[PDB]
Design a binder for these strands. Structure first.
Ligand SMILES: [Mg+2]
Ligand SMILES: [Mg+2]
Ligand SMILES: [Mg+2]
Ligand SMILES: [Mg+2]
Ligand SMILES: [Mg+2]
Ligand SMILES: [Mg+2]
Ligand SMILES: [Mg+2]
Ligand SMILES: [Mg+2]
Ligand SMILES: [Mg+2]
Ligand SMILES: [Mg+2]
Ligand SMILES: [Mg+2]
Ligand SMILES: [Mg+2]
Ligand SMILES: [Mg+2]
Ligand SMILES: [Mg+2]
Ligand SMILES: [Mg+2]
Ligand SMILES: [Mg+2]
Ligand SMILES: [Mg+2]
Ligand SMILES: [Mg+2]
Ligand SMILES: [Mg+2]
Ligand SMILES: [Mg+2]
Ligand SMILES: [Mg+2]
Ligand SMILES: [Mg+2]
Ligand SMILES: [Mg+2]
Ligand SMILES: [Mg+2]
Ligand SMILES: [Mg+2]
Ligand SMILES: [Mg+2]
Ligand SMILES: [Mg+2]
Lengths: 206, 262, 152
RNA sequence: AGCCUCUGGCAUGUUGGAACAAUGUAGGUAAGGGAAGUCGGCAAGCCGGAUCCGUAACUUCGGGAUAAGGAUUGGCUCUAAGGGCUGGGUCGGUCGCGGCCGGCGCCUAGCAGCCGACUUAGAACUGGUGCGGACCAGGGGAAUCCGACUGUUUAAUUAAA
RNA sequence: UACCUGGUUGAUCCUGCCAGUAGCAUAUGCUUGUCUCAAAGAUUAAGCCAUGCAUGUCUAAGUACGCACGGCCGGUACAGUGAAACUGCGAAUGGCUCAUUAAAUCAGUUAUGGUUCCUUUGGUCGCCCACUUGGAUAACUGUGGUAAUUCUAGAGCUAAUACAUGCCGACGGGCGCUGACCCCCUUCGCGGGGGGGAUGCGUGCAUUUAUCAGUGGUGACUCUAGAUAACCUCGGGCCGAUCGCACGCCCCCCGUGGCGGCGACGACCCAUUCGAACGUCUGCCCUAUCAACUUUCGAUGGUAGUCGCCGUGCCUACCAUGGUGACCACGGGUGACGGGGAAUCAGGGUUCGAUUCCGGAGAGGGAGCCUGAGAAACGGCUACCACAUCCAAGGAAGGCAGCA
RNA sequence: AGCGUAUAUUAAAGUUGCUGCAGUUAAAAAGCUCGUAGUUGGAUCUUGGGAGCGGGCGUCCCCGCCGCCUCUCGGCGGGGCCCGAAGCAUUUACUUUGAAAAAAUUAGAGUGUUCAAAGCAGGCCCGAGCCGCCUGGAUACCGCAGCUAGGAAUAAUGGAAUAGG
RNA sequence: CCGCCGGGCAGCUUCCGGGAAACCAAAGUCUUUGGGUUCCGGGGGGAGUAUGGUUGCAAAGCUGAAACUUAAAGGAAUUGACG
RNA sequence: CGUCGCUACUACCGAUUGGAUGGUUUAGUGAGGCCCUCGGAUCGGCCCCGCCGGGGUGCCCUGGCGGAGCGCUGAGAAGACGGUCGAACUUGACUAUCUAGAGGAAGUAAAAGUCGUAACAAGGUUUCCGUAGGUGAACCUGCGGAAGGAUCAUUA
């Protein structure tokens, strides 16, 4: 099949290696996952060792995190943005390690709105007034008010994130191998990271 | 090759299950075990080749599957189960129980011990582990791991293991001044107190060793397994006591014992 | 400037960098806390490793590589690649017949971390055997000494 | 270039109507074979544009030479790659958004916005393998004879040596 | 044993060769009383092959209801030998040969902190079916084809450690964060301090991702270990909670509940053992009538990726424009599988090493494949090519470089 | 009891010459010169001397000593004591000692195989009442490269000079 | 004219020592074998041929094989003997 | 010594886009596997009803016999779209090796034919090198060389 060997290609100088053996079950290459975004679809593979390998071909959701806040709700991966390697993998919406992806904000919103109890985006008073104060309005007080006033200033977000939550989509980057692992795990692009990738996107579209 | 190799040619067979060129093509091959193939004694060689207890291979088959032979007090039916530095090998219907100490030439003895001294046993240590939840692990040279060791046991030291329990009972750090048998190379089954070791980064470390008579061999660390606090080996030694006599001396001393002996 | 030039973002992993809701400007003064290591065998992890703004995974003074085996030296002959040079190891291979030697050499491509500045050709350089790092390159430069010959 | 069209020009090149015979003169097309054809491949067709690949003997070392021999080529949706033009002297003072002074700045790695021709490369998708689809458009090779090459010549039968 | 003798010339001394000499290495020429050791179709043709064989396996311990035979004896399911069949292993070693292969095999040396590992050893294993739930095939029984094969049609049964499933367990008990809340001290009250909290959600050995802190271990952690947040590779993680033969017991106690030895398969974390693998440094035959090679068909490198077991131009994309060379590359050749050795030999070499020991490769040739820990496996198969058998002309079966 | 010829190959070959050939005439030194790789390259740098022990009042052979630095580093409220670290052996080349070197082969210990090629056993103790003793399965080499430790004879190589320790 | 000195062209002479010999201050320092280094020969012919490459306008130049055949060809000196 | 004469053997040149095998491969075509996307012989299970029976509180839990939605997950063959390694086949290129060949020209054998007589003696013309030109053949002649001479001198 589709081997992985130093056995065939030229030497440093530029002489052509002769063969040696046949291809052995060894220098074995399987074809790619080039995993998409759809309802979940993963085949197992039997590999060397015994052991197994979770090659994702359709993949919808990721277990993937704030840096700073120190959480990681499991969230839908909405859509691929740019992938530094190559610009088919964007268009085809192929998730691979260090793809930049849009995701659902919603599960991250909904634990400030537990924890520090201060909103995101900006709104007039439609969702906020029935439900945030349903998270707030205390009849315990004293201990708790002290507690998420100790969760002080620093229920704070960078403008760059604050923005995205209007939209209900966050920029994140894959750090697992969908084809090897079986998942599309990652971090949220946060702070410095977050600033090319916007400026890449902006400069790319023009 | 394709798989792993389940076979051993006589000749290729190491120098000490002491086999001869005629009589066969193959040698016995240690079945996989705790001890490395090259530093073994497959039980089979004791019986027919060392003790002349059996004669053939089938004679030995009929021995071990009566279930007499107990390699460290745990009964083996494998004719080719590997023994190696620091084992026991109790026969029980006989009451002999040997070790497996190597001679001064490095070729595993027929050295009988008491019924006592078949409980205590020695083992060098290969690593500290820290397994999980902070439960620390040893790895003895005979591939026992032993959980829950005294934290002062470090690497290359030896342990005075029991047997029926497993467990540990008191021990010898690897300082200067303690007693060493050598378990690899040339100075092999030769015995003496240390002196001084030479730490090198990267390449493995050298150990200078002085003996009774005053002959300094050195060795790589990974061959030295220790046997006492200093001029007091806890085990019984083989006759000769890993002193090693120059062929000149050995020749004459053997021959000088002769004539005067009667 | 300088650092993030390529396409993907280049960052020392095992430093997560952001958390800040306090005064004292914005971020620290080092700003990014820099992951570096001591390598071993006593070679001083140089100043520009620790000081440096820079980033190369294949540098042992600022990234994931282990040095672990055979330490050699050679001379720098070409610096026309980027983060790699070519060194040239000279010797006498001995014939026994002809009771004499002949000069030989096996030039050897080798990683050169850009911490390690002001290198030139005709430059004595010491190298560690590394992980098989590219196709040819298994070695990584550890201490340049510029020594024999010429000037400061 | 060819071929289709506006401006401008005609009204089919001294007649018309009706059929579609043979011979013709102009055009076309043929199963299988494929020069067997004649003095001879006489006419025609093969080739044909571009991009990519590729290239002989021989030599006057220029050539040969588009040698030879191959691949690709549509529509569509993309991507990538090729440029101009303007903008910091901000801070303080003072003078009338403007100037002047003085000070800091000094993108001197630039970045920001605003413009505008064109090209080229690559990737999907896609169509009964169609794509230089109309037209434009070198058949090739191995030899010998002659004449170094360009040119010229018998206006109305010889263009060649 | 450091070694020589014949031959050019009417005669001489040389250069120089020819010819002798001995061993070794292979031909066969003749002869052959004894006895001990002992090589053998390698060179040519990895050419071809008739036939005969070279790889099966049962303890007590995975199923056994063949009537096979007894038992010894039954009715209670067993009992005990036991032909078949499923299942688990092996078949991945060995054996053969050297076609290829010139830094390629391979030696020594080092690395794996750039990895996998059946087995053995050592360990480690408590979150309403468990008093085991379901279901389905082989032998077996019967009815079937085909000319023919180690070809099956089809109807009944019936097992399991084969295939699925999935429960007691543990403590409405304990500890992480949430907490309906509550009390006391202090305060004008806000507030400050001390407390205590029903009820939620969590309630892990492994997984992947994210973060945090700095018991033990190295020259060498970006390691082990620990803390927080998550997920489920999900049927295709594991254990989690697995099944046989010996059948031997004790109960503040009468029949239950506890207990005993053996095995088998699990397995997760792990170690270990046989390894396997891919790297380091340094090491080879001839040839210039081979001087430049290498590079959008990866050449060398950077970045980011895919694939794998893993680092890696293993592959893709985008960048750079590199790397080798007369210390002879690059090109060509070999009557080249590589070592360990051999016969020769004053010291130094010279050629041979297909040769039993080690290392490599291939089973007409390539490629791809299943299966498997482990193979790209040839005593498997899939075609093709290259070979070749039987034929009822529809079809079928072919691989000696196992031994003969 | 072997002995013949077939040819490959080694000595013989001081006829491939490193050791170690040859170049007036015998086969043979470019027509001459320049010149990049290569090979090759003067001299010159710690010594005489000291202190002792030991052979042949002193003289003349023969040995351990006067690697330096560090103590910035360990420790076998202020310590020493010096090992632990490194300046590191300028940077090698060189030499010597270790360690590592699969067995078989080889070299070669041991052994009435009846000898020998071989074999690795055998030997013994024993009238067998011992109901059993005793010993082996020696060692050297194992290129180059790699690893370790001594030495500094020679060969390169380095350091202060538009100033620096 | 008579000396000396450096380096030049040369001569004679000799049992240094070389040298098969002729001869040679050097062809000396060589089995008492190696100061440095360049080239280059390995019986004679075939053959400086064929072929290949290259330079040249070309004569040709440079690089440069084999099958085959062949026993001596040759060198230095001795007597001869014939010019 | 050479042409010339005859015979024998080698290799050479040689018109023949001469033939054969091997190795690369440019171009096309491309078996089968492998992956991906579909598919869906079928086979269930879940279920929904009709009727009936046993157990429980018209309803539920089991059982029996019928029917139907074939609702919705599972398994799931044949098959098909794509992609990847890729033997194989077809046409070019190179290089390797090996050979067929009308006729032409050397050498050698080799060794006793004819015509001379080039060389060795002052070889009758000192010899030889290189170059050139010539010639039946050795050859000859220019020019410049050489002595390996037939003169180490020519007698201020
Ligand atoms: Mg020599
Ligand atoms: Mg008309
Ligand atoms: Mg008109
Ligand atoms: Mg026709
Ligand atoms: Mg005709
Ligand atoms: Mg025409
Ligand atoms: Mg032409
Ligand atoms: Mg003309
Ligand atoms: Mg005319
Ligand atoms: Mg003689
Ligand atoms: Mg004679
Ligand atoms: Mg001879
Ligand atoms: Mg094998
Ligand atoms: Mg291992
Ligand atoms: Mg050949
Ligand atoms: Mg065959
Ligand atoms: Mg194979
Ligand atoms: Mg195969
Ligand atoms: Mg076979
Ligand atoms: Mg010879
Ligand atoms: Mg000799
Ligand atoms: Mg000679
Ligand atoms: Mg001269
Ligand atoms: Mg001479
Ligand atoms: Mg000499
Ligand atoms: Mg010759
Ligand atoms: Mg002459």
């Amino acid at each position: 099949g589709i081997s992985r060997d130093n056995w065939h290609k030229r030497r440093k100088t530029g002489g052509k290696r002769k063969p040696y053996h046949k291809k052995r079950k060894y220098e074995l290459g399987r074809p790619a996952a080039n995993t998409k975004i759809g309802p979940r679809r993963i085949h197992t593979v039997r590999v060397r060792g015994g052991n197994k390998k979770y090659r994702a071909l359709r993949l919808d959701v990721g277990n993937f995190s704030w840096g700073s806040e120190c959480c990681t709700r499991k969230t839908r991966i909405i859509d691929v943005v740019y992938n530094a390697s190559n610009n088919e993998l964007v268009r085809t919406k192929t998730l691979v390690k260090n793809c930049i992806v849009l995701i659902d904000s919603t599960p991250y919103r909904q634990w400030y709105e537990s924890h520090y109890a201060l909103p995101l985006g900006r709104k007039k008073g439609a969702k906020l007034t029935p439900e945030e104060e349903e998270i707030l309005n205390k009849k315990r007080s004293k201990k708790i008010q002290k507690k998420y006033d100790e969760r002080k200033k620093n229920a704070k977000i960078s403008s760059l994130l604050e923005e995205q939550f209007q939209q209900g989509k966050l920029l994140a980057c894959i750090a697992s191998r969908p084809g090897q692992c079986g998942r599309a795990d990652g971090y949220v692009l946060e702070g410095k990271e977050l600033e090319f990738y916007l400026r890449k996107i902006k400069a790319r579209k023009g | 090759a394709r798989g792993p190799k389940k076979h051993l040619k006589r000749v290729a067979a190491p120098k000490h299950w002491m086999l001869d060129k005629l009589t066969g093509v193959f040698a016995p091959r240690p079945s996989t075990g705790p001890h490395k193939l090259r530093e073994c004694l497959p039980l089979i060689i004791f019986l027919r080749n060392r003790l002349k207890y059996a004669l053939t291979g089938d004679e030995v088959k009929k021995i071990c599957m009566q279930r007499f032979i107990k390699i460290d007090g745990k009964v083996r039916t494998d004719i080719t189960y590997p023994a190696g530095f620091m084992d026991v090998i109790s026969i029980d219907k006989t009451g002999e129980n040997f070790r497996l100490i190597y001679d001064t030439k490095g070729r595993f003895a027929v050295h009988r011990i008491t019924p006592e001294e078949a409980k205590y046993k020695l083992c060098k240590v290969r690593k500290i582990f820290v397994g999980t939840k902070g439960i620390p692990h040893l790895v003895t040279h005979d591939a026992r791991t032993i959980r829950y060791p005294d934290p002062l046991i470090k690497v290359n030291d030896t342990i005075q293991i029991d047997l029926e329990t497993g467990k540990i009972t008191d021990f010898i750090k690897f300082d200067t001044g303690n007693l060493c048998m050598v378990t690899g190379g040339a100075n092999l089954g030769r015995i003496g107190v240390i002196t001084n070791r030479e730490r090198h980064p990267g390449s493995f470390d050298v150990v200078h060793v002085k003996d009774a008579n005053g002959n300094s061999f050195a060795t790589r660390l990974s061959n030295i397994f220790v046997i006492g606090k200093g001029n007091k080996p806890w085990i019984s030694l083989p006759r000769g006591k890993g002193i090693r006599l120059t062929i000149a001396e050995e020749r004459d001393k053997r021959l000088a014992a002769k004539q005067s002996s009667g | 400037a300088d650092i993030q030039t390529e396409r993907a973002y280049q960052k020392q992993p095992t430093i997560f960098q952001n958390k800040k809701r306090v005064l004292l400007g914005e971020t620290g003064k080092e700003k990014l806390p820099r992951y570096y290591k001591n390598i071993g065998l006593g070679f001083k992890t140089p100043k520009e490793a620790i000081e440096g703004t820079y980033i190369d995974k294949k540098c042992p003074f600022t990234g994931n590589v282990s040095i672990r085996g055979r330490i050699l030296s050679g001379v720098v002959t070409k610096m026309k690649m980027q983060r790699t040079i070519v060194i040239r190891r000279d010797y006498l291979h001995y014939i026994r017949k002809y009771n004499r030697f002949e000069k030989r050499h096996k030039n050897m491509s080798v990683h050169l971390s850009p911490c390690f500045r002001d290198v030139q050709i005709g430059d004595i350089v010491t190298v560690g055997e590394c992980r098989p790092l590219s196709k040819t390159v298994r070695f990584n430069v550890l201490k340049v000494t510029k020594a024999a010959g010429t000037k400061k």
